[PDB]
Symmetry: C2
Subunit: 246 residues, 2 copies
């Protein structure tokens, strides 16, 4: 429950235990990962491991606001991971701004906003990112992009808007930090939009609960887990790192 879920610090602990026990899972690409399966925690920090990168997150936000399904429209030089997963025409699925703001995904943000505006206690206030046809759309034109966020539900209780984020898959290092920033953005916008609609509502942002089928770290980031395991420091540069994982 929202009231006492796991914290991010406890998520760190369990990832550390998974690495120390060598609880390894081979990836779709043949690499090792460690995982929490069925993860569920309150996102009480904006990152788990790694450094801040407000600048990349702002670029991704602008790409989301454009709703463009083409990775080249990401501001500046598009990251290599986006180039790799895109189709032969540069197209993807996981533009989250498209997911919640495009008419072609059935106006998720606006309909959730309207639902909660008419019934503050509604259990039907939700933004549905993925879609049944994703079973076939994830590799359209040779892309490799099976939507990672399934749904985000918004529940207003005691004048706080809580977000229940349901993801099938989330990378602990870049993924969570970028996706948290996005979900906090949408939550704050929804609070502001509802408050602007009626001054008697007086809502504030509540808790963001993170639910992930596979919350994982790739072997290329094991050094971050190991360094935190040994020192409590959530970040170290790869150059400075001294330890087992290169």
């Amino acid at each position: 429950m929202i009231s006492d879920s796991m914290t991010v610090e406890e998520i760190r602990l369990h990832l550390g235990l998974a690495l120390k026990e060598k609880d390894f899972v081979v990836d779709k690409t043949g690499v090792k990962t460690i995982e929490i399966i069925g993860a569920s925690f309150v996102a009480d920090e904006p990152f788990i491991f790694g450094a801040l990168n407000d600048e990349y997150i702002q670029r991704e936000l602008e790409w989301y606001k454009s709703k463009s399904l083409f990775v080249k429209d990401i501001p500046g030089e598009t990251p290599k991971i986006w180039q790799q997963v895109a189709s032969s025409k540069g197209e993807i699925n996981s533009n989250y701004g498209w997911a919640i703001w495009s008419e072609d995904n059935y106006a998720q943000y606006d309909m959730c906003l309207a639902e909660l505006g008419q019934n503050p206690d509604s259990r039907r206030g939700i933004m549905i990112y993925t879609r049944p046809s994703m079973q076939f759309d994830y590799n359209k034109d040779g892309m490799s992009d099976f939507m990672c966020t399934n749904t985000v539900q918004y529940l207003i209780r005691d004048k706080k808007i809580n977000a229940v984020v349901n993801m099938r898959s989330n990378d602990v290092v870049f993924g969570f930090r970028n996706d948290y920033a996005w979900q906090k953005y949408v939550l704050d916008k929804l609070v502001s939009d509802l408050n602007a609609g009626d001054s008697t509502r007086q809502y504030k942002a509540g808790s963001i609960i993170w639910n992930v089928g596979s919350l994982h770290v790739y072997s290329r980031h094991f050094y971050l887990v190991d360094h935190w395991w040994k020192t409590g420091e959530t970040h170290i540069s790869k150059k400075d790192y001294v330890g087992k994982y290169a």
Copy 2:
């Protein structure tokens, strides 16, 4: 995480505490509910409160296997709740057999089966019940049926198939017990289908993790919570009940 989520017995405790503290939420129909928001627990029992009803569950299973979107096709006299939520033509959305077996919902079961058959470690093995167009489809032709199950993801680790059930809304009393029976059915079928595909796999059913945006009890069932709170008995007939909630 799968390893130590809440148990059903702890879910009972928290619902009991919600009732004792009069933590009430008014329903879409003007009635009271108590809730766990962002519930996440291992379904280590097949019910929370209430009596067994294997016979109703078997009728619902047959209706799911028919994939019929019409409530009259439920075997026997269709329950009043199904008649109430159906459209002017008797139609609904939430036939879960349609959701996972119909071609019109993009072959969720078969595609999840194929995905896990080719990549046992896949994070993309999922059955997507709801859909973005649900923002408009939930009241087609005057029905009132916004799909309650969003997604169910299947993760095979250490030869155990775990199910991560993501629901926006679940009634503790009839809902959870019926829906648990269904999700356990699908999980066992998926295990059997994968094992029948290759005798080296040797999978077994793992844990079913239940994630619910609003896991709630309606006031008409508060007596069950209260009786359990006072006695530890998970069921009492309404006739036998003596206490505050009629």
